[PDB]
Symmetry: D2
C-alpha cells in the first residue's frame, strides 16, 4: 500500500473511494456519520506514490533546460477501478452544479445511497 | 518506468515535465518545435501507475456498499519533484488568464525560455 | 449584447454555445469546418459583462480590509439556457476522460452530431 | 445589483470578494468569525446575471443545430476589479496545494490578514 490506503475500519457500512482533493471532505463526512452510528471507511488512491525519485533525478540532472508545465486532472476513480479490477461501483457522488458538494450535501447523498 | 516515462529523444534542447491533461498539448508543441530545428522531450509523470489491482480488488470485493466520489487535482509537478529529488526547476508554464495556454502560446513561452 | 455575442454568420450549419475557457478551441474548430464546406457560428455567453464598475468601486472604496478569494466554475451552459429560455439543447460536447477534448476531437464530435 | 450583491453588513472588519463556487465556503467563514466577534461581509460577483433571455432565445430559436460545449473558468476576481475600477486588492486567498482551502484554513488566513 504505497499506492492505495484504506483509512478507517476494515468493515464499514459505507466504503468511500476517492483520490486527490476530495480526501479531506470525505474524512469529515466519516466523522459526522459516527455521530449517527454509521461507520464508513475510505479507500484512498494515491497519485504519484511511491515517487520515481531515481528515474526523475537522472533524467533532469542531465537536461539542458527543464520547463515544468502546470497541469490538472478530473475523474471518477470508478472508471479506472473497473478497467483494472472488473468491479463496477454503481453508486457515485458527482460534482453538483459547478462545484464539489458540501460536507452536508455529501452526507445527505451518502445516507440516501445507504438507504436505497 | 511504470511510473514516469521519457518521451522523445534522450538529449534535447528543452525537457518538458508534466502529468495529467497537458500531455497532449505538449506532444504537439514538440512536433511544432522540430519544424524550427528545436528538439524537445517530455518527462511524463504517471498518476495511478502501476495500479494497485490486487489491493483495490480485495478491499472492494468484501465491502457492503461502495460510493465513488468524483474528484480533481491541480499542480505544478515542480513542487513534488523538488521534494523528492532536490532539483528545483526554475522555468514554468502556468495557466494563463483562467485557461490552459494554447499550443501557440506554449510554443511562444517555450522559445522565450530557451532564449533567456 | 453586452452579455452574449454571436460570432460568425447569422445562419450556420452548426451553432456552438459556450462561455469561459473553451471559446478559443471552438473558434478554431469553426475555421477547420470551413475547409470542409461546413459553416458554424458561436453564441458566446459573457461572464461578468458589462461589469458593475460603480457598484464594486463604491463597496471596496470604503472597506476596512478586502480579501479576494480565488475561485472557479464548471458548467454546461445548457442548464441555465433551459432555465431562462425554455430551449433544451439536446446535443453536447462534454469533457473527455479528465480533460477538455482536443480540436480534432471536438471537430469529430461536431460532424458526428451534424450527421446524426 | 443584478450583477453584484453585498451580502452581510455594510461595514465589516473584513470584506471578502468572490464569484462562482467559493461563495458557500466564504459564507460559513463569515458565521464562524461572528463567534470570535469579527464581522465580515461578502461582495459576490454574479456570472451570467441578469441573463440575456431574449437575445439567446432569438439566436437559438432559429438555429439548424445547436451544440452546447461544456466549459470552465478559474480566476482571482482581483484582476478584473483592478481593470475596471482601479482598486488593487492586495490580500488574497489562493488555492492551497492542488485544492481549495478548507473553511478552517480560510478562517486561519483571514485572521492572519486581519492581524497583519
Amino acid at each position: 500500500a504505497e499506492k492505495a490506503v484504506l483509512i478507517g475500519e476494515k468493515e464499514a457500512d459505507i466504503t468511500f473511494v476517492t483520490w486527490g482533493s476530495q480526501k479531506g471532505p470525505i474524512l469529515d463526512v466519516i466523522e459526522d456519520l459516527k455521530e449517527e452510528g454509521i461507520s464508513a471507511n475510505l479507500l484512498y488512491l494515491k497519485m504519484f506514490s511511491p515517487f520515481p525519485t531515481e528515474f526523475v533525478k537522472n533524467v533532469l540532472s542531465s537536461a539542458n533546460l527543464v520547463i515544468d508545465v502546470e497541469s490538472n486532472y478530473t475523474a471518477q476513480a470508478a472508471q479506472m477501478i473497473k478497467l483494472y479490477t472488473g468491479i463496477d461501483i454503481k453508486n457515485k457522488i458527482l460534482k453538483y452544479n459547478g462545484r464539489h458538494m458540501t460536507e452536508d450535501e455529501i452526507l445527505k447523498s451518502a445516507k440516501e445511497i445507504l438507504n436505497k
